């Protein structure tokens, strides 16, 4: 009876979502003029990493950036002067994520050791010191995001997400609705709510304050590796291993547009938006990053010039440039 | 055209670059091996003989540093982390030999280990990575094979009930699973109570992989 009730409710939600799909964004955006093809040129090339890059995050001043690699090193760079600001040696080399504080005081890093280590960048002694190590997860950490100085939401491979505070060290909130390993997180600009992507071909919209799931998106055929909020905060885009990106709405609670091409069969490792949201940059497994446009959904450019799988990318908070890290041990800046 | 503070920052960056270069040169000279195997096989016993999230064990034998990584604890999806370990000298693979007739609810434990062996061996990340197969228990298998025939484990088996024939047969069955014989050679050893023999065999296999890597680096091969 319970399974039958679940089936009839799922049918009801399916019909109600089809009752609001009278129009499509593909035909609405027909009238707008096509943007000129975005031909970017590498303004900087950062050298000093020896192993592969796993994550990057921009600072709030659009000048500092962090990168993590399998030589045990987390390196903070100045992009303008193409030099190194900090080099932090990690206790566990198998790091899979990094995050930068909105205040710029702290960095976090998680890995296979099921521990999220937090480092303080502004000490009186002048050396980087680990602040707090969080070990409450039974699975490898996939992502971490700083809500603020004192709160940090983390994502882990044990089919759950956890919101922690750093002063006490206890998990303040627990988010458990996924049936597969959870791969990614993205925060709203106003920090009210966050989205999570997992290995069950679904993405969930949670709530920070009450601590309960708000929405559930089930439209993919393969697992979701990348998630990013739209800058307005009322939509998001996905990225999966079946060579397609999909645009979901927090309001319509369903898919809006599909970014796919016939000659692409490779996996999508990272997704990021432009400041206006007009462009959508997607890092593929074909050794190049393709730039699409959100509205029309045709290709607007290509960023080639990497020697191995592109694993991460990010646009600055003011949108002046975009950095791409990859498995070739390099980190490039395009504009 | 450069201020004093900017020049000092460039000097600091050069010092960081020098320290990173020294750390990279130190890091390159150490041999890292993943330790795979089923749970009840007895990997911990092999670790204790040679000596939460990730277990790293480092030992020095014949002026060559070895770091051993143990991924057994994590019960998550194995594909998601099977690509960070792409660069690796060899894969130790420990299989219990005395569980041919044991049934754990898969019909046979031996199939539960051959499945893992097939999954790891026929992988894109480890096309050329060598595999070092250890049969963990020999005396208990001898006592069992005396007390119980192997005809239950394998539908079709030869007449010879001798321990050597059964050992050879199991070894051939594990070696058969490799579908690319030329690129990767699997080394099969019999675990004994002598630590020196096992460490020496691992050292010889690692030495052969180092010989292959040197041949690739020079370009002669």
């Amino acid at each position: 009876q319970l399974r039958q009730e679940a089936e009839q409710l799922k049918n009801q939600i399916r019909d109600a979502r089809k009752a609001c799909a009278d129009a499509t964004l593909s035909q609405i955006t027909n009238n707008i003029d096509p943007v000129g093809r975005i031909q970017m040129r590498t303004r900087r090339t950062l050298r000093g990493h020896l192993a592969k890059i796993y994550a990057m995050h921009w600072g709030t001043d659009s000048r500092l950036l962090v990168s993590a690699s399998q030589d045990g090193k987390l390196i903070i760079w100045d992009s303008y002067t193409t030099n190194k600001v900090h080099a932090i040696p990690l206790r566990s080399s198998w790091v899979m994520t990094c995050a930068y504080a909105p205040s710029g005081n702290y960095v976090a890093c998680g890995g296979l050791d099921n521990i999220c280590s937090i480092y303080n960048l502004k000490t009186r002694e002048g050396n980087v010191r680990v602040s707090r190590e969080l070990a409450g997860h039974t699975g490898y950490l996939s992502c971490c995001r700083f809500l603020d100085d004192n709160q940090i939401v983390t994502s882990s491979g044990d089919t759950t997400c956890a919101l922690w505070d750093i002063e006490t060290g206890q998990q303040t909130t627990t988010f458990t609705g996924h049936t597969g390993d959870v791969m990614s997180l993205s925060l709203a600009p106003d920090t009210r709510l966050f989205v999570s992507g997992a290995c069950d071909a679904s993405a969930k919209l949670w709530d920070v304050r009450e601590g309960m799931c708000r929405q559930t998106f089930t439209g993919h055929e393969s697992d979701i590796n990348a998630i990013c909020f739209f800058p307005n905060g009322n939509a998001f885009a996905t990225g999966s291993d079946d060579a397609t990106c999909r645009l979901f709405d927090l309001r319509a609670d369903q898919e809006l547009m599909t970014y796919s091409h016939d000659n692409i069969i490779c996996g999508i490792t990272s997704v990021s938006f432009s400041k206006s949201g007009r462009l959508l940059l997607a890092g593929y497994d074909d050794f190049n990053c393709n730039v699409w446009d959100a509205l029309k959904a045709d290709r607007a450019g290509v960023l080639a010039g990497h020697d191995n799988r592109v694993s991460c990318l990010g646009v600055t908070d003011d949108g002046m440039a975009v950095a791409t890290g990859s498995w070739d041990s390099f980190l490039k800046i395009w504009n | 055209t450069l201020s004093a503070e900017d020049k000092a920052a460039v000097e600091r960056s050069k010092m960081i670059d020098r320290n990173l270069r020294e750390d990279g040169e130190k890091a390159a000279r150490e041999v890292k091996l993943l330790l795979l195997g089923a749970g009840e096989s007895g990997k911990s016993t092999i670790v204790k003989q040679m000596k939460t999230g990730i277990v790293e064990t480092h030992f020095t034998f014949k002026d060559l540093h070895f770091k051993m990584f143990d991924v057994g604890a994590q019960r998550s999806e194995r594909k998601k982390w099977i690509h960070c370990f792409e660069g690796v000298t060899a894969i130790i693979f420990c299989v219990a030999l005395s569980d041919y007739d044991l049934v754990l609810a898969e019909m046979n434990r031996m199939h539960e280990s051959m499945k893992l062996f097939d999954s790891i061996c026929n992988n894109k990340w480890f096309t050329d990575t060598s595999i070092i197969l250890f049969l963990n228990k020999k005396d208990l298998f001898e006592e069992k094979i005396k007390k119980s025939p192997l005809t239950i484990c394998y539908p079709e088996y030869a007449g010879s009930n001798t321990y050597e024939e059964a050992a050879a047969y199991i070894q051939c069955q594990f070696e058969d699973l490799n579908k690319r014989k030329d690129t990767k050679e699997i080394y099969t050893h019999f675990t004994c109570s002598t630590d020196t023999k096992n460490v020496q065999f691992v050292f010889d296999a690692v030495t052969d992989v180092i010989i292959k890597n040197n041949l690739k680096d020079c370009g002669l091969f």
């Epitope: 000048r63 500092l64 100045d78 002067t81 600001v85 009186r124 002694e125 002048g126 050396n127 | 055209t1 201020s3 004093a4 503070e5 900017d6 020049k7 000092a8 920052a9 000097e11 600091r12 010092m15």
Partner: single-chain antibody
């Protein structure tokens, strides 16, 4: 964070002496170090600087050659060797830690200082303060102005002006670095402002502890010339 100076004593002219600075509680290996001298009736004067790793060493023009500076990183000790001492070299010496990178605050910690008593540049920016003393009362705001003989506004947008307070019988303290950012451990009352050569520090709602000499400093070019010093009074 402690710096302890030693090796200072009264000497006859022509003697040779070694100064030793003992850094404790912090990472002395990655910090560039300065020696700065203060005359009894004159302002603070920079003497020398050694960078991290001893890559670049700079000296004042007057004391160039004769004074030599060395640093020992494992023992965390700074040595200054002084030879051919004269009448002019009768000052109070400060050992100063400074680290240079983007967003850093140099000259954050100032040493206690030792005393040396002797029983006897055209390209330099002449930093000039128009006032020697401002008598005021606690509670009311005060503005003290510093002026430069060369534009400190570099191409990158930074204006290398540093504000220091020296209470009587105390070490100097950094208030504002690069004439914009308030330094740590300093209340929000102090504020630096100004355009080009013109520079105005403002101290709203003055309190009893604000009494002391104020020094403006430039950092545009290597012979660092300090200011005369505005002795604020009650």
């Amino acid at each position: 964070v402690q710096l302890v100076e030693s090796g200072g004593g009264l000497v006859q002219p022509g003697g040779s002496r070694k100064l030793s600075c003992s850094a404790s509680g912090f990472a002395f290996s990655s910090f560039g170090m300065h020696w700065v001298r203060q005359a009894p009736e004159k302002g603070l004067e920079w003497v020398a600087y050694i960078s991290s790793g001893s890559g670049t060493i700079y000296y004042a023009d007057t004391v160039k050659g004769r004074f030599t500076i060395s640093r020992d990183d494992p023992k965390n000790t700074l040595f200054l060797q002084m030879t051919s001492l004269r009448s002019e070299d009768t000052a109070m010496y400060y050992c100063v830690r400074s680290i240079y990178y983007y967003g850093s605050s140099p000259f954050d910690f100032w040493g206690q200082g030792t005393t040396l008593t002797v029983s006897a540049g055209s390209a330099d920016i002449v930093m000039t303060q128009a006032t020697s003393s401002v008598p005021v009362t606690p509670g009311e705001s005060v503005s003290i102005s510093c002026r430069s003989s060369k534009s400190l506004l570099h191409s990158n947008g930074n204006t290398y002006l540093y504000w220091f307070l020296q209470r009587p019988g105390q070490s100097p303290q950094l208030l504002i670095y690069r004439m914009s950012n308030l330094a740590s451990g300093v209340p929000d009352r102090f504020s630096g402002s100004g355009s080009g050569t013109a520079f105005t520090l403002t101290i709203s709602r003055l309190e009893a502890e604000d009494v002391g000499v104020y020094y403006c400093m430039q950092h545009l070019e290597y012979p660092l010339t300090f200011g005369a010093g505005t002795k604020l009074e009650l």
